[PDB]
Design a protein around this ligand. Structure first.
Ligand SMILES: Cc1cc2nc3c(=O)[nH]c(=O)nc-3n(C[C@H](O)[C@H](O)[C@H](O)COP(=O)(O)O)c2cc1C
Ligand code: SF4
Ligand code: SF4
Lengths: 996, 1001
């Protein structure tokens, strides 16, 4: 034996970058720092002017793109505000609060479905909306140092997961069968142009039940500007495809090759052919051009943006050569100019100047869009109106501008004495767009147009001066964004509907009502029976502060809850007075304030309201809500008369069941629920007093919750509720006083912990009563705050699920997220192609900044982290590879969808004793270097809490697990990147780690 | 009446509460555009002009953090090994350590960390270009949410330290002043009182030198931090506080003395007894240009060195004995330049009331010198920018400037910049500000440095490792040397010089110094506080120790932990060979008790880990080694046997004779609960067996999985335990995948078994156990275990009755070096109890002010009158009552302890006097919620939580989204519990009569 408690020098050497307690101030010269600094540089460089080659690079450049880890953190962050201003600031009124709520709960289907109900192009809009002049500009968290939520990145992600699940849209299932629809619904509707505006309008019309809807498009491709000009590196063409496949799911017909124009389609022909309504969504087809450019061609290198963008599109997109070398001048200050500037780099420009008429603060493009130009090392020339495109040699070679300025009233002039000669090869008119075409205008004869030569519409109804013809989108000249065009189709859709019905003799609601968005997921059954009660869904308010009053129970039933407990009430004699404060927040996960508290503590007593109030309540609630279960929670002292007098009273007022609150003192713990013989007897009393089911509610503050459960079963209870709160003390202030602190003496008493902090306790309770009394109905409670969690508890043996803290953290409306949540989890289970996901979470792509990190037998296993000079090299392998390189059918369930009753107790078979655990099938951890952000947490935690088995490279900060791994699994557990360390099977000799 | 229907008043109260929708909403695009302006929080692109900034010096930094923000951002940091942010900080700050103190609520440890490596830590927080420094290296840049706000964190912790008003002291490691070798009375001069010389002077003083003098030419001190950086990025009182820190060490400052041939020169210093000298005089002069010659400030012409120091002097109260006022600069202003100097000219101009500002650069946007935490300030004050214009002729039309003429510049295929002679621009203007940078040109100064070598650029040449000039006794750094660029580098220059000046001077007295540089850290009297505690007759040097767990797998870990400063460790639990076990894998997973947060600060872990797989031979030998080398750290051998009197007596004696200070009996084994520890008679017996086999103290480790933990603790004391460890982990199960499989999941069958939960999730449970045993068995010694992850939570257990503190999960979340936080945390916490001027602090946190992104919020007269929140047209109407006050106007004595500094023994169990039965709580003194509309951020959460979990007792105003708590509140306190804004809501005594309402009377 040598010195067992000193590390032999191999491990002395693996430990070399571990943290050590620091005892002097370090010594490093400014010159050495200046040199070291470049080795770890993550970012953008201002000692760098030629960033990478961009040419033929159409990969995603949005900064708001989120992967799953990222999207889960941002959604948790959001406050989920009442009457949210984000949604006030959204042109299409998306319920962001709900959809953000659902993301936080891993319900991507319910988020996506909320998103698409109010915007049928929610993905597109996720990607391109200028959120900072819309929803994000209104977010309450801008009032904090960390700032607004990335709402669009969240909208983007949920819809992207919903893309991947491959679920069709369906007809409004509320609606009658098709052959039973009134006749008005078969009127022919024509929409002109397949852009966001008509796609939106026909979707809503399809949703209302219209069966003969046709989109007539000029071009061969669909989607309007999102296809032909929004770049592929901000809006992938296949996002656009998928949103149109959704619309086509509802029966909308598209016909390409037929234009609104003289001797093609006109209003008058639309009339003779029997169309009843026409929606005009043709956009602004023509380029706002300057006279000085008259005569130049593409051969001399002149393009309008309507020449240029569609060409680059046709080349980087299944939509239908690129070649812009040298110095490029881009004229204009809107979105159009900024997208030419950046697609220029993609056909290989050496330099891109953007030149503005007016100045910097007059930039109209989407400040996100101005970002991409800045970081690509575009040049910005303010205050210069064009005058002369000098040509020589067949090719443009410069351009002569005049200076402009404004004379402290606010109007502009030009100084002829001052010109710039501006060497260039390509000039791109990027001013904007108009409707000029007279054969188009003729085709709308006779509607009125205004000054601007746009169709005039009433802006509330979208109707033109002909009442069968409507218009929306860019062509009306008010909307500048995709989400505003969509909202134009939305608004039009309802008044087209009012107009068509009236022509057939019928009238429509007074309050506009368009339908939500639907999928087959929504038809999934999620009722369950337990103790011979039918629950319309398995979620319920527990007996607790959300049921302080019976009008709140009323409001919760109308929001959709399946059942509720009354707050526990007692005979009169037994009535109690609360103290205040008595509900405080948990400290169970550090100093996070606001949404998502991991527990609360309460020292709250039973109801201050009387048995009379509560019985009369129960009767009013069961009269108006016959299919909602109402359980009456009651409490007495250890007293046979009381327990019989109170359970008969509750029963006769019409409760579906009782809950015995077993937290009363005795006179084997001090509360009744801590002693089996007392619980046995109480159950015997109640069982002989009433005929309805009753459940005993167990306390987890016991050595063996199984022997209280059984006692209840032996005493005749029809089930148990597991569990009530854990006894605890939530913490002390640094001078010693507690919180909650009552009176001027700052007194406290022990309280009950609730929330997700206690979920492991409750789950293990539920699991262990189910293995031991299998068959005996359990109602779970303790930290249920999504559908995924409820499902854990159902899997564990519970039949219905009681909720308290998740509603204190939010409001009765989570119920909508729990339902669509559970319908989604059960439906995915019938989808073969999606067997690799965990519930709604896809199999994880290898990501940094939640984007896919490439695959080339160079970058795979020659150690290149994403920083410093290695980064510089991955970006040269990736931008000489883009040099070199120059079917949608919905899944179908194949197994019927399971009911709740088919998933209850499924997990029970995987539990067991410790010696049913294989000690033969050992694992090692394994780190995916493409997924690693170089933190060294796996390393610090294997060193001071593990087996010193990870090498951490001092020059790359890449870790590597050695053959010493014992599969403890700590490293996986602390790693911030989801699915970066995987546990795999040991493949070489492990004997245990014995010491001498 | 229908009792289960709201009344009509309440139904009105409920108008804005959420409701599950059923219809897509209809709203015209035109209406949406009208309604958008009502809610807007931000500076809008419709919007041309700016606010009125004249005479407005209020902080504009985007990186300033209040306590809420700062705790959130420190918890986000991964606290990385070998951290690249620290590699990228020019003074090598230990970011990971200071950010872990902040996130453990120990601002004093943070601050001491910061000021140890950088004596201008607070300034550097405010002004560092951190995207080109520490923030540019952050690993979290590789995530969507991005890099950590290090500048911000460093700033907030240093402000809390500035507010505690604690002085620095002499490194208490030194011998007393008269035992010091004569070398340390060597006279040292430093030239210039900026960052470089403050840093250098400070580190020299740390080392023991008593006779240091900084000679300052001006009459203010601090160099450019004082004379040019504006007040609204770097307030003056921060500089004054870093200087005071320096003076506490005895550094002397003399103003109005110049390095100059007419005054101080290297000769008059050599002749008057200085043994060494540091040149940090910066770059005194502007970089002038010929086309401005002979144009004075009477004419609208300034250099940056004329302009900025006026703006300073009238906006920095405390800097001059002269009083003077803000230069008036109406009109259009041209700023020439694109570095730091120019952008501060451009914002300082808008405060002088310039009507419009244009920055004109010789080169491209792609070529700008300052640091986009700066350039950003000028874009959002609406300054205009003109690239590729170099100035030719300033046009002087009878007295005033009226214009400037320029030529377009561009690059050739050479890439070199040349000037199109004919393309000329005639920008009118009233004021011109050249902000090209600085030089040393003055020959009076060069000559006083004679004879050191100067280089091309005309600066003292130095050795860049040692900061030495060609004269071996004269050093130089900071701006004067041409490398430094930023304050923190100029600090580093002097830090680096200090140790070589130390080596130089000790040689000159005939001594040598270490090979490896060793500058002392930063100390204050807080570090001298004693935090040892005596327990069961053992003395602990500090009350923090490693629990029996994965962080004590191998005795070589315990060796490293003792070397990092842990007071004590348990071994993993071990047994006799016949009970040795085989472990499974996976066996330790992360909690789901706080949702899907990956990375730092997990709220719990689960484990299905058994006892050590190393044998009692290995362990017993280790305890001998360890006690051999660490006789002052306590080492407790954790042991386990079946219910068997011989085995327990033999194993406890084997661990006695190996040298252990104590034993911990782990009562988890099995044969009202299958484990020994769950039954009071089995515990009494196992404790009796051990008590009779050994004479050292031993502790029973109790499980919280029981009905009454007191009864088991009492069972331990009845059979002789010297105390109890409370508590082992909580029985539980961490969750299942959506397919019903478990995690952990072992082998091909993916089986699992019940496990134990650990970490801050079980603290309520362990605290209750500890306060329970402590009231029932007064004076019975307790070791506390269960969710201790900072000094602060640690003090909670001491207050609850514990003497010493076990840690596992917080080290699994991080590494052994948290101990340093715990120790400085707990000294800071005790010391602060003696500072009566801080009685309103809650430990190290200061009583809140009215924050809005961590900024003082207005306390005006009609503004506190009729309710105005921070968005839409109300934001504009405050911004207007914030251009009326700001156009209505156109120190550190250290605290002394006044009470003795508690020992640990003085705080044990003080929380017991507040704990009691429910019957002891007063129901006479009821409270109500009151809300501060200034701190409110308009979320609705207090409202929704009263609406669906409360008493419908808050009104949410439809236009302002401002809540008001109404007379029907019962104090339940949920709203205060859900508010995101720390101490916006406050629970106060009812003054009005209260009926606890009953439904039916
Ligand atoms: C403020 C509050 C009050 C409660 N009041 C009662 C009660 O009166 N009767 C009862 O059986 N449970 C009561 N409970 C317990 C809850 O019904 C529930 O069992 C516990 O909170 C754990 O579930 P949770 O994670 O969803 O909150 C209360 C909980 C809280 C926070
Ligand atoms: S000193 Fe500056 S560079 Fe260093 S961490 Fe602080 S802010 Fe960063
Ligand atoms: S204390 Fe309770 S009743 Fe009062 S306002 Fe807050 S939530 Fe409501």
């Amino acid at each position: 034996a040598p010195v067992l408690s000193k590390d032999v020098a191999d491990i002395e050497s693996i430990l070399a970058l571990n943290p050590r307690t620091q005892s002097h101030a370090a010594l490093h010269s400014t010159l050495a720092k200046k040199l070291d600094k470049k080795h770890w540089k993550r970012n953008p460089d201002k000692n760098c002017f030629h960033c990478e080659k961009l040419e033929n690079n159409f990969d995603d450049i949005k900064h708001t793109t989120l992967g799953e880890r990222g999207a889960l953190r941002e959604a948790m962050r959001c406050l989920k505000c009442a009457d949210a201003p984000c949604q006030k600031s959204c042109p299409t009124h998306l319920d962001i609060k709900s959809f953000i709520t659902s993301i936080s709960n891993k319900n991507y289907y319910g988020a996506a479905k909320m998103i698409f109900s109010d915007n049928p192009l929610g993905l597109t809009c996720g990607m391109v909306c200028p959120t900072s002049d819309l929803c994000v500009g209104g977010c309450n968290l801008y009032a904090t140092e960390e700032g607004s939520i990335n709402i669009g990145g969240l909208q983007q992600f949920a819809s992207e997961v919903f893309k991947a699940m491959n679920i069709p849209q369906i007809r409004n299932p509320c609606l009658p069968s098709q052959e039973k629809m009134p006749e008005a619904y078969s009127a022919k509707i024509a929409l002109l142009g397949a852009g966001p505006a008509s796609i939106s309008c026909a979707s809503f019309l399809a949703r209302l039940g219209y069966s003969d809807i046709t989109i007539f498009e000029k071009q061969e491709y669909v989607g309007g500007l999102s296809t032909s000009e929004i770049p592929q590196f901000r809006l992938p063409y296949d996002v656009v495809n998928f949103e149109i496949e959704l619309m086509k799911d509802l029966g909308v017909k598209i016909i390409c090759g037929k234009s609104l124009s003289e001797n093609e389609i006109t209003l008058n022909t639309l009339k003779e052919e029997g169309y009843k309504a026409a929606f005009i969504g043709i956009g602004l087809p023509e380029p706002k051009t300057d006279d000085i450019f008259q005569g130049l061609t593409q051969d001399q290198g002149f393009y309008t943006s309507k020449d240029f963008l569609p060409l680059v599109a046709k080349s980087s997109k299944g939509m239908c050569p690129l070649s812009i070398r040298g110095a490029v001048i881009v004229l204009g200050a809107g979105d159009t100019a900024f997208d030419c500037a950046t697609s220029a780099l993609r056909c290989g420009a050496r330099r891109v100047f953007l030149v503005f008429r007016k100045g910097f603060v007059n930039i109209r493009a989407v400040p996100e869009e101005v970002e991409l130009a800045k970081e690509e090392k575009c040049e910005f020339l303010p205050f210069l109106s064009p005058r002369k495109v000098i040509v020589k040699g067949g090719r443009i070679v410069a351009v002569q501008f005049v200076r402009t300025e404004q004379d402290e009233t606010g109007k502009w002039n030009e100084d002829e004495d001052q010109i710039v000669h501006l060497k260039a090869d390509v000039v791109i008119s990027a001013f904007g767009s108009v409707l000029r075409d007279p054969k188009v205008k003729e085709a709308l004869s006779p509607i009125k147009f205004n000054r601007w030569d746009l169709p005039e519409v009433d802006p509330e109804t979208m109707q033109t001066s002909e009442p069968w013809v409507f218009a929306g989108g860019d062509i009306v000249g008010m909307a500048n964004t995709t989400v505003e065009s969509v909202n134009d189709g939305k608004q039009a859709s309802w008044y087209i509907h009012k107009y068509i019905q009236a022509q057939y003799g019928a009238s429509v609601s007074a309050k506009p009502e368009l339908p939500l968005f639907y999928t087959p997921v929504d038809l999934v059954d999620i009722s369950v029976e337990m103790a011979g009660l039918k629950f319309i869904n398995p979620f319920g308010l527990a007996s607790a502060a959300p049921t302080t009053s019976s009008s709140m129970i009323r409001r919760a039933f109308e929001a959709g809850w399946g059942f509720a407990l009354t707050k526990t009430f007692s005979l009169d004699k037994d009535i109690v007075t609360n103290v205040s404060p008595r509900i405080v927040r948990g400290t169970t996960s550090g100093p996070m304030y606001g949404p998502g508290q991991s527990s609360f503590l309460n020292i709250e007593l039973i109801s201050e309201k009387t048995a009379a109030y509560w019985c009369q309540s129960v009767t009013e609630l069961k009269a108006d809500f016959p299919d909602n279960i109402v359980i009456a929670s009651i409490m007495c002292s250890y007293n046979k008369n009381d327990w019989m007098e109170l359970s008969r009273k509750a029963e006769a007022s019409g409760a579906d069941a009782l809950e015995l609150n077993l937290s009363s003192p005795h006179g084997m713990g001090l509360a009744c629920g801590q002693d089996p013989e007392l619980v046995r007897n109480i159950c015997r009393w109640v069982r002989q007093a009433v005929q309805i089911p009753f459940f005993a509610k167990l306390t987890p503050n016991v050595t063996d919750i199984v022997s209280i459960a059984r006692a209840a079963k032996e005493g005749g209870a029809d089930g148990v509720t597991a569990t009530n709160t854990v006894s605890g003390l939530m913490g002390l202030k640094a001078d010693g006083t507690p919180w909650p602190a009552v009176g001027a003496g700052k007194r406290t008493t022990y309280g009950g912990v609730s929330g997700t902090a206690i979920r492991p306790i409750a789950l293990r309770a539920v699991t262990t009563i189910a293995r031991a009394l299998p068959g005996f109905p359990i109602l779970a409670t303790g930290g249920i705050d999504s559908a995924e969690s409820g499902l854990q508890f159902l899997h564990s043996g519970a039949s219905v699920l009681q909720v308290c803290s998740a509603v204190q953290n939010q409001d009765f409306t989570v119920i909508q997220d729990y339902c669509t949540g559970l319908k989604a989890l059960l439906y995915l289970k019938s989808i073969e192609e999606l067997q690799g996901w965990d519930g709604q979470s896809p199999g994880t792509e290898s990501h940094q900044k939640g984007k896919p990190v490439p695959r080339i037998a160079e970058l795979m296993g020659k150690k290149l982290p994403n920083f410093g000079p290695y980064l510089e090299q991955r970006k040269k392998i990736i931008a000489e590879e883009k040099m070199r390189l120059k079917e949608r059918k919905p899944f179908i369930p194949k197994k019927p969808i399971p009911a709740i009753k088919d998933v209850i107790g499924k997990a029970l078979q995987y539990l067991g004793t410790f010696g049913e655990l294989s000690n033969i099938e050992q694992v090692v951890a394994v780190i995916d270097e493409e997924m690693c952000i170089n933190c060294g947490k796996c390393y610090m935690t294997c060193n001071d809490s593990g087996y010193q088995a990870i090498q951490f490279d001092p020059e790359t900060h890449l870790p590597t697990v050695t053959d010493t791994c014992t599969g403890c699994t700590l490293c996986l557990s602390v790693c911030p990147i989801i699915d970066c360390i995987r546990m795999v099977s040991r493949t070489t000799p492990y004997e245990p780690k014995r010491g001498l």
